[PDB]
Amino acid sequence: TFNDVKTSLGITESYDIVNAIRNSQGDNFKSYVPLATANNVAEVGAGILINQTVQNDFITSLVDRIGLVVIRQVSLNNPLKKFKKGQIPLGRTIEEIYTDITKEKQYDAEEAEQKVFEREMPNVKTLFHERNRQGFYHQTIQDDSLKTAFVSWGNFESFVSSIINAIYNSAEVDEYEYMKLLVDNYYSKGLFTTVKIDEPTSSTGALTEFVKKMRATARKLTLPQGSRDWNSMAVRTRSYMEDLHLIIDADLEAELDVDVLAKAFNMNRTDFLGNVTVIDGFASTGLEAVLVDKDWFMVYDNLHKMETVRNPRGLYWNYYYHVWQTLSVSRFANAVAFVSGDVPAVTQVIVSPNIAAVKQGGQQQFTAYVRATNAKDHKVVWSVEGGSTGTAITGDGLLSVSGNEDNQLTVKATVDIGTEDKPKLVVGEAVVSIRPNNASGGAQA
Amino acid sequence: GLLSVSGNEDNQLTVKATVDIGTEDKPKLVVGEAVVSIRPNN
């Protein structure tokens, strides 16, 4: 019921072709001049967006029919599916536990006589994960309406099947996209260790330097002794080469192959050391390569259930494909981002004792791991908020709690990147419960 | 022959060395050539 639809609907024609052919002499279209129906081919060949009624040439009143219905079937997957960690049938929340190494104390027998039972808690850190996704793919199918379009059950039925498959495609595409979201999210928070590099999709010198950084970084991640600099939680973590995954994209893949590997006699000396898992790219500005541990992803499924119902009045089925899942990232897993353009001097101040519980009047030592992106030092300022008059923290991170404290506290680690006119107060933060002691009171103490 | 690149160099460089064989108004240069690519460094 659209009426005057042109065959040129939406065609941003670059020159024509018919004119080109008929006006071709030694203009390369001369090979088409001998063709008897070239013009008709030119008119239709591109494909028709909207069917218009076509009459039979022999008998005007007859209508030419559709002699073939081709229902395409596409099936899409999830490139990152392999990073799914399973299912959590029951229980919503996941708890990760990680024990950080201890410190070396100098041997001192004298002092030891008053410290035998000192009691020193381990550097244990935990992290929680939680079911985050909960949505569904709603698809309605008006069976009998579709029946007036089709003239064959093979076509009709397969069409419907395709619709249902589209639901599943929708699901996996989005799942993939959510995993990407997690990367851009983690980045937007500033939790990746940032390795700045010159753009690798330009001069091969940039590409080369990039590759070196990738191989070197991979090795650094896998060093036997471990390191804190690749871990968002700033704990000594050791990785393994076979557990590293390098995401990057199709551009870099091609750049490496052609410019480097094609010439390399020893390709294993310039390839990537981890498991390369090419994706379409990231949204974050300048975010390119991402190198992470296979356990960085904390993706678990909670629900995959197709629900259906038929509306008896409005003839149609509804399909509700429910997808619930835990979408999160481990901060204990190693994670490095390679970034092109300019980044902050400090992307993340990390306070070690995220959760503390200092009894009224006591003390707690804090540690900051200012995630600098360069060689410049970045003095950090300690402060406390929500605290009483006597609660304060030493410039070295040593927190002193008031003898009358009661309010839950928070401790900040501030690093100013910017300047006087526009300071860039990068802040790390930790919280402290008081669970106050007793048996005191009075005056003078 | 000390090649020096202060930076801000995005073009491939050609390093040549010549010897003037012949005479005045007859510079029959003999020339050697090295290929220099540039690796970015902020």
How far is residue A100's CA from residue A413's CA, in Å, rounded to a whole number?
A: 21
Q: Mutation target for B interface from A195, A202, A203: give the one with most B CBs within 10 A.
A: A203
How far is residue A172's CA from residue A325's CA, in Å, rounded to a whole number?
A: 12
Considering Cα of A43, then A45, then A48, then A52, what sign does the dihedral take? positive
Q: Does B8 touch chain A (CB under 8 A)?
A: no
Query: Which among A331, A320, A329, A335 is positioned nearest to A300, based on CA atoms?
Result: A329
Burial class (CB in 10 A: 0-12, 13-18, 19+), A156: middle
How far is residue A440's CA from residue A434's CA, in Å, rounded to a whole number?
A: 16
Give, in order, the Cα–Cα distances in Å from A264 to each of A176, A271, A320, A348, A428: 34, 10, 53, 39, 45
In chain A, whose CA is at the least distance from the CA of B36? A205
- Helix, strand, or coil here: B29? strand
Order across the sheet with A193-196: list the strands.
Answer: A193-196, A335-339, A287-293, A244-246, A275-276
Q: Are A353 and A428 contacting, i.e. CB atoms less than 8 angstroms apart?
A: no
Backbone angles phi, psi at A180, to 5 degrees: -60, -40
Query: Which among B33, B35, B38, B41 is positioned nearest to B10, based on CA atoms?
Result: B38
The pair of three-digit structure tokens given for residue A217, joined into one six-digit string: 């970084």
The answer to whether the CB atoms of A209 and B10 lie below 8 A apart is: no
Contacts of A203 in chain B (CB under 8 A): 10, 37-38, 40
Q: Does A209 touch chain B (CB under 8 A)?
A: yes
How far is residue A357's CA from residue A382's CA, in Å, rounded to a whole number?
A: 18
Q: Does B39 touch chain A (CB under 8 A)?
A: yes
Q: Which residues pair with A36 in a beta bridge?
A: none
How far is residue A317's CA from residue A310's CA, in Å, rounded to a whole number?
A: 4
Residue A229 DSSP one-character state: T
Considering Cα of A428, then A433, then A439, then A440, what sign does the dihedral take? positive
Round to the nearest angstrom and report the end-to-end CA distance of chain A: 92
Categorise residue B22: left if φ over 0, alpha if ψ from -120 to 50, beta otherwise: left
DSSP track, A262-309: TT-SSGGGTS-SSEE--BS--SSTTEEEEEEETTSB-EEEEEEEEEEE
- To one decimal, the resolution in angstroms is 3.6
Q: Does A259 touch chain B (CB under 8 A)?
A: no
The distance of Cα A108 from the centroid of its chain, to the nearest Å, equals 50
The answer to whether the CB atoms of A206 and B39 lie below 8 A apart is: yes
Residue A334 DSSP one-character state: B
How far is residue A385's CA from residue A407's CA, in Å, rounded to a whole number?
A: 10
Round to the nearest angstrom and report the end-to-end CA distance of chain B: 25
Residue A176: CA atoms inside 13 Å, Cβ hemisphere, count? 18
Task: For residue A194, give how far its alpha carbon lies from the nearest alpha carbon of chain B (Å).
Answer: 16
DSSP track, A112-169: HTTTTT-----EEEEEEEEEEEEEEEEEEE-HHHHTTT-S-HHHHHHHHHHHHHHHHH
Query: Which among A273, A276, A191, A201 is positioned nearest to A233, based on CA atoms?
Result: A191
Burial class (CB in 10 A: 0-12, 13-18, 19+), A195: buried
How far is residue A229's CA from residue A217's CA, in Å, rounded to a whole number?
A: 11
Query: Which among B29, B12, B13 is positioned nearest to B21, based on CA atoms?
Result: B29
Contacts of A374-382 with C-beta under 8 Å, sequence gap 24+, read: A374/A345, A376/A345, A378/A345, A378/A346, A378/A415, A378/A417, A379/A415, A380/A349, A380/A413, A380/A414, A380/A415, A380/A428, A381/A413, A381/A414, A381/A415, A381/A416, A382/A411, A382/A412, A382/A413, A382/A414
How far is residue A37's CA from residue A355's CA, in Å, rounded to a whole number?
A: 80
Encoded amino acid at B4, one letter = S
Dihedral Cα A254, A255, A259, A260, nearest 10 deg: -90
Residue A261 DSSP one-character state: I
Computed on alpha carbons and rounded to an integer, the radius of gyration of chain B in Å comes to 15
Q: Does A203 touch chain B (CB under 8 A)?
A: yes
Burial class (CB in 10 A: 0-12, 13-18, 19+), A316: middle
Give, in order, the Cα–Cα distances in Å from A32 to each of A7, A43, A204: 22, 14, 44
Q: Which residues pair with A245 in a beta bridge?
A: A275, A292
- In this structure, the strands spanning A287-293 and B26-36 are unpaired
Helix (H), strand (E) at residue A385: strand A381-385
How far is residue B42's CA from residue B36's CA, in Å, rounded to a whole number?
A: 18
Query: Which among A254, A198, A193 is positioned nearest to A227, based on CA atoms?
Result: A193
Give, in order, the Cα–Cα distances in Å from A315 to each of A148, A216, A228, A311: 14, 62, 61, 5
Task: For residue B32, give how far its alpha carbon lies from the nearest alpha carbon of chain A (Å).
Answer: 24
The pair of three-digit structure tokens given for residue A108, joined into one six-digit string: 């001192």
The distance of Cα B40 from the centroid of its chain, to the nearest Å, equals 20
Give the CA diameter of chain A: 115
Contacts of A206 in chain B (CB under 8 A): 39-40
